[PDB]
Amino acid sequence: KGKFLVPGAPTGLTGLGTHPSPRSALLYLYHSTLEKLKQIPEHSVYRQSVEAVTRHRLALVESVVPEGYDAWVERAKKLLEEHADQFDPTKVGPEGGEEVQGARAVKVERDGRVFVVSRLPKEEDERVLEWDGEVDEGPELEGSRTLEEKIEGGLEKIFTRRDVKDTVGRVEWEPEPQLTAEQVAELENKIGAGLIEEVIQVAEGELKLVDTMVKARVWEPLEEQPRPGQWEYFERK
Amino acid sequence: TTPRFWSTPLKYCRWAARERPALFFSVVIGALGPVTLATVPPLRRLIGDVDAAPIPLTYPIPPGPRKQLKGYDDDTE
Amino acid sequence: VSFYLILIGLNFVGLSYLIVYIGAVSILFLFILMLINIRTSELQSNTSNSIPLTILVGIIISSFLFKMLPYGVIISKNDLF
Amino acid sequence: VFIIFFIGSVAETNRAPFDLAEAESELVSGFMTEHAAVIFVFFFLAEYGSIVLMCILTSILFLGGYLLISLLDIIYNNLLSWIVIGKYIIFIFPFWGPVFIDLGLYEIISYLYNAPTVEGSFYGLSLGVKTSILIFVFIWTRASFPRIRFDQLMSFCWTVLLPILFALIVLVPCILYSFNIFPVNISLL
Amino acid sequence: QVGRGGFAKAMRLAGFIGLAGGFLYFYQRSILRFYGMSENAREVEMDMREMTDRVKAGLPLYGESRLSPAMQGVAARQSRYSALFFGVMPWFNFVNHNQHGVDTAKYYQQAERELEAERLAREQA
Amino acid sequence: SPFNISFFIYGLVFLLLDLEILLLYPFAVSEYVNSAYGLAAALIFIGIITIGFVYELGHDALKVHSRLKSSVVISYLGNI
Amino acid sequence: MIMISILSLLLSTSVTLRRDMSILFNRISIIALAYCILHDTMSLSFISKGIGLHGGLLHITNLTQIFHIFIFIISILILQLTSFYPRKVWIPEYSSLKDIFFNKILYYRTKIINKMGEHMKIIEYPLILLFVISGAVFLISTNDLVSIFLSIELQSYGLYLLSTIYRNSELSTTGGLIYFLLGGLSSCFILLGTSLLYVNSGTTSLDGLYILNSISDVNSWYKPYYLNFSLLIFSIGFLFKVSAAPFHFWSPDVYDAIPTIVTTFVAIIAKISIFIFLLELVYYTNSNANSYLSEFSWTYALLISSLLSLIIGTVVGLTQFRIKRLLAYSTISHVGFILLALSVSSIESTQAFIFYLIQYSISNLNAFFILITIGFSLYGYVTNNKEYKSLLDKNNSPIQLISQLKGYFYINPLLSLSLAITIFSFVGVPPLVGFFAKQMVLSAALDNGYIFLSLIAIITSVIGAVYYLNVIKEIFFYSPEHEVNPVLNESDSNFSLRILNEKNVLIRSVLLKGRNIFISSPFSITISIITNVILLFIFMNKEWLSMGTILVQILFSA
Amino acid sequence: PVPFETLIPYGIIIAMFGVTGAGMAKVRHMFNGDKRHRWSVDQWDKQQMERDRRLTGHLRGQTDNPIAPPGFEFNNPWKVXXXXX
Ligand SMILES: CCCCCCCCCCCCO[C@@H]1O[C@H](CO)[C@@H](O[C@H]2O[C@H](CO)[C@@H](O)[C@H](O)[C@H]2O)[C@H](O)[C@H]1O
Ligand SMILES: CCCCCCCCCCCCO[C@@H]1O[C@H](CO)[C@@H](O[C@H]2O[C@H](CO)[C@@H](O)[C@H](O)[C@H]2O)[C@H](O)[C@H]1O
Ligand SMILES: CCCCCCCCCCCCO[C@@H]1O[C@H](CO)[C@@H](O[C@H]2O[C@H](CO)[C@@H](O)[C@H](O)[C@H]2O)[C@H](O)[C@H]1O
């Protein structure tokens, strides 16, 4: 019944819905954060502060393991190995393909760790879904048309896309097992920063700050000194 | 979430009575007219509630030959 | 026309005209005409040109069609009562 | 059918809680232009008279119209000791021998009951009492509810009320046929 | 190349039209023997027997109508040879009128000749 | 500024249904003579104009009606 | 059965909003029209000039049912245009019974088959045609003035809606607007004529009017002048609806503006019902006795229309460069032959009238299918001509100019000969079917004294043959301005097609180029059945012509 | 408590409806010959009142005499119109 959290169920906070995979998202964000910190020198207190905190949270996240994780990961290792070209960002883009009505995965590497980012076609009512959700680019150009117009109309996509039912050279990526609802609660009682989904919001904020903290080089000496009498107010004596 | 009539007919009818009441009970009432035509009239003839004869809307002329009256003649005037 | 018919005994249809034309058709006409942008000078044509053709077609249609009407419609010095 | 008619009759008069469309004009007038229903009592007498008229017609159709529930039928059923001496004894548990004056009251009362002025008066006081009760229910409705948005009133009419009405348009003549109760359409009554 | 549920929806509609056209064709096949537009030797005998069996039972030949003699005549004018217009418009007779296009003297004649046959047999024994 | 199409639909759906109910008022003042045969025809006429009403109900022609989980799912595989 | 079909289809399309669900509703509209053909086919076991049904407001005739079934089949052939995708992919590896029945092919079909094309997305298009068909088969069987009026409006209003259904084309909405505004004025004429009939005769029944005309036709206070004056106004409205000159300026403009799929239906169906209805009206308004009544015969308007339609239709078509405007004018010259056969009321003219209408409805249909198929064929072709670049609604009417057909013999030789065999039938060259139609109309006219019109007809037939040959010279006498698409055959450009089996296991994979994309079978087979009927009629003429001889034997019988 | 002041206008409306029905029943009574007025009158009722006028001179007049008075045969009114028909 309530063994697992429904994904996208309201959390109590408006606009924040239950994460489909909270543990792996948090792991992905932490490791990605640790990788961008190597653009920053070692003697900056910013990097040490972010490193220590990030590693501290990374340790507690890894302290909990979903049931069946060891079994699942062994199959997923092989499934990647024998079908690597299916999940390659250099082959199928950062998105896992263009057939949004079909399953899309991609292998991504951060900081010595391997992740699969699988984007799943949205579950819609059959009573409203046209052509199983295949995106409508419009009608094909018909009639007397030029070579250039046919190209900009997408004709070369005939020899690239695939029928969504065409699954012979491909293998289905199976998702990671989730934490239980009680396990998620225990994760929350360790990290100590509220709801798991709200921790991901903070965690993906630390990821974005590194890009600004490197571009501005905050560890460099003070730019503009206070000229004399700049922060002087009305103090007596 | 919301059911499908042709997968679960009884389960759809409960949802529609609860979630689309004005629409659901419109089709219910409309069906009761067809039912009431089929049911009450035979039961009425079972209990002996005979339908009333039609009222006359024209002069009621009796059939057959004229009766050859005798009476009320010009001499009586 | 609705009153003309009510006045001569045709109440239901005379009331039907009221309910249907003035009630609903001319209302739909008013909606569309009060929402479409209309520049009242682009709909104006030189009407003075078509006076001769108005003169010609008025005589020809009137002279022919009137013979087709029945006696009861054109029933209206000894006057028949 | 009566409830739908009364609700339809409030919405038809543009009265609150169905007046948000004409209500929003005063909120977007701006700093350059203004309304036109200003010094005119016409569109106010046209409005109040259409509310009163929608109350009289609502009473004509569903309440009695001018029909007073006559108590003179009840007294006939209860009273059984008719007396020619004017006593007018009643065969009831709270009854006694009344002393109604034949010369003074009964002769006068009987005549006034059959007067053309008195009977017409009660027929119009009945229709008036019934119209006034409905005038109360219009005023009570305006003081009880907030306003409905135009799309929501449109949904009420087109996806709730009219479907129910067309369902009842099927059912009603079907029952009148099933119980031999189609009335005669000749001039009777 | 339709989506997931589209063919199931269409199968339902094609199925209703099949029950519709299927019943109209079955009814129209039987009723043309009544009209004389199909070989009807079997049904002439079944008609002669039943209609004569009704006469001798005192029954109205075509049954009793709750409708007025005038509404019975409107009904009859609407349904006479109407299965011939089935491909455009569906109509069925559900009224007990006595206007059926046939001279009913034969049913009465045959009832009379059948009654006179049975009476002699009873008198013989 | 473009005008909204729903104004047109209000007048049209009224215009047709108002013509349709008008065609039924003669039935209500002729019921006794019409009887069963008239009822059946009127039921057929009521049924046809009802089906066209469920079409605008089914399509929101009056345009009165019609007024989230993330697809991105990450999996952890471990070290290389 | 047409009415049970509209209500059932209406209920289904009322609760769905899915546009992918249109191809299947058009397939059921073809199955629906097949049950109607099974019902009218079985209603043909009697002889009668007519049987009044439903209170006398309708009639049934042997000529009425034959035309009901002809209407249903012409409708089933146009419906195929919206029930099957325009192109298909075929490989000899998937061509046997075991394959087409138990195996399956999987590939990316969307851009090959134009799955989300416009004509594949309207959901109410199968329903609107079925309401037009209903008005047509009611007009055929109308026995009363009101019934005529209510039927003609049911058919006319649905034609306007079909002409406006491509809501996102400036051309289509313009054409529907021209059609409604000129069509509404035509309806006033039809309504004026019927009103003046009832107001002078006291009757709305055609048979009563026929008897009032029958008693008058004898060689004092009440001359029946109204019948011929009323029917002349009445026929003016029906002349406009069939686009006979002088009331013809609307058809070239409307037929060119609306999409070609649509102009197949609109430019065929209304003539079949209007011309069958007029024939019965001409037979019973005849003046057997030469009296003053025949001097004002309403049939003179048809004789003047036919004469004017023969000239206008063949002269104005000489300078057309747009193919659909050309075909619109060609139809006006064909109604000048239909109208002459109707105007001469004889046993031979009616048999020639019945043949001309059926065969012309069948052949102009082939001219519309060939045009639509050629448009779909150029998907694997490209062009650099500067004039084709500026055409409008290039998707709703792919072929618009006669110059876009230059060198089609080089692209598709037999499709070009199908368009040749069909156009030579319009000219009236033997042994083609359209010869045997003009032969009968000319023989009927000559036998009964219409020598002057016959000489006019054969003169304009030479003139009308000029613009037909310009189409033939353009397809065969020149080299195409359309070249194969270079990318479709690039050696590196191939689409992978998977052969599965019943339990969805790969049987084979195949590599396919644009050379493996063809026309769909419903279009190819329909074209070949009609081209063969036009070319082989001289060997298969007994049943078709005999049906007409029997039909006119009853209408004229007794 | 009962706010009879707010109730005063409603009583006014009831008194006005009473006066219309009161005063309209009496004007019709006198108009109809001090007898109650006719209501749902069809063609039959109107012609019956016309023959009442023929016998008495009043559309509401009533007489039980078995024989019609001399002249009754010629007083049958045939209406004449100029236009409608
Ligand atoms: C179905 C049978 C109906 C029988 C009774 C029919 C009665 C019809 C009477 C119509 C008289 C005018 O109708 C009435 O006009 C007035 C003035 O335009 C409108 O009143 C309007 O102006 C007033 C201000 O002056 C506003 O307070 C009101 O909100 C606004 O709508 C009413 O909304 C309308 O109901
Ligand atoms: C190019 C020309 C296009 C013309 C379009 C119209 C063509 C019409 C062709 C069909 C003509 C009638 O075809 C007829 O169908 C009916 C169907 O029951 C059958 O006819 C049969 O009917 C009944 C049985 O139902 C029998 O009692 C009868 O004796 C027999 O003739 C035969 O099959 C055929 O005689
Ligand atoms: C005898 C009286 C019968 C009265 C009517 C009986 C019920 C028939 C009407 C409802 C039939 C079902 O029709 C259903 O209507 C609903 C409500 O608009 C539609 O609703 C759906 O589409 C519309 C339009 O996009 C959306 O605004 C809506 O949110 C969505 O749920 C469904 O697309 C349609 O399937």
Ligand SMILES: CCCCCCCCCCCCO[C@@H]1O[C@H](CO)[C@@H](O[C@H]2O[C@H](CO)[C@@H](O)[C@H](O)[C@H]2O)[C@H](O)[C@H]1O
């Ligand atoms: C490419 C074209 C190929 C040929 C296309 C046309 C072929 C079909 C033509 C059939 C019509 C003529 O053929 C004939 O006509 C008559 C009158 O209509 C009808 O004849 C019908 O009525 C009679 C009279 O009661 C019945 O007894 C007979 O059983 C029945 O068939 C049939 O329809 C058909 O038998």
